[PDB]
Amino acid sequence: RPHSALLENMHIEQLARRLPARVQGYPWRLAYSTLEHGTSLKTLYRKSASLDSPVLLVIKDMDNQIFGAYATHPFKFSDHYYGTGETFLYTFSPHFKVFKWSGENSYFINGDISSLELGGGGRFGLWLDADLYHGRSNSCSTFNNDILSKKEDFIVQDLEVWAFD
């Protein structure tokens, strides 16, 4: 079993039970960490470039709340949305909750030069700036999610991207 600087053992177990069958039982491998690597979206893209695997995004904001996404595709720069229906958002605040694909649109993942976002329909379920510093979470139609953080706007304390290959 893995050790995360952000997820306690109980959180890892709750998340692992919600992963799709595609990666059930697969060991977790830490591909990008703001604690270990340069803190920037560019570094995240570069550390994701060799991944042959769906990925698990783990964010801890400056209020110590934990939330993120399971994405069917490694995070990459794009000029249109990508990802498919197994992508979901999750949060642990106030309690562990998963927001699966609603079927309403397929705006799962978009990697801009200056931001990474999941969800669409002008709200993003999850948005991170180019420094992985400012973030935002809104209810969006892709996932019909709750605001993943306390309020809409948050600050990343640290984040991790795990892979299964």
Author numbering: 54 to 174, 176 to 219
Could you give the paper's own sentences about this structure?
Nuclear receptor coactivator 7 (NCOA7) belongs to the TLDc [Tre2/Bub2/Cdc16 (TBC), lysin motif (LysM), domain catalytic] domain-containing family of proteins. The human NCOA7 gene encodes several mRNA isoforms; among these, isoform 4, named NCOA7-AS, is up-regulated by type 1 interferon in response to viral infection. NCOA7 and NCOA7-AS both interact with several subunits of the vacuolar proton pump V-ATPase, which leads to increased acidification of the endolysosomal system and consequently impairs infection by viruses that enter their host cells through the endosomal pathway, such as influenza A virus and hepatitis C virus. Similarly to full-length NCOA7, NCOA7-AS possesses a TLDc domain in its C-terminus.
Here, we report the crystal structure of the TLDc domain of the human NCOA7-AS protein at high resolution. NCOA7-AS has a tendency to aggregate and to form large oligomers as judged by size-exclusion chromatography (SEC). A full X-ray data set could be collected and processed to a resolution of 1.8 Å. Most residues could be rebuilt for the six monomers, except for the first two amino acids of chain A and the first three residues at the N-terminus for chains B, C, D, F and E. Gly175 was not modeled in chain A as well as the glycine stretch ranging from 174 to 176 in chain F. Residues 146–148 were also disordered in chain F but were well ordered in the other chains. The overall structure of TLDcHs is globular and consists of two α-helices in the N-terminus and ten β-strands forming two antiparallel β-sheets. The two sheets, organized as a central pseudo-orthogonal β-sandwich, are made by strands β1, β2, β3, β4, β5 and β10 and strands β6, β7, β8 and β9, respectively. The fold is similar to those of the two previously solved TLDc structures from D. rerio OXR2 (TLDcDr) and D. melanogaster TBC1D24 (TLDcDm). TLDcHs shares 62% sequence identity with TLDcDr and the two structures display an r.m.s.d. of 0.7 Å when superposed over 164 Cα atoms.
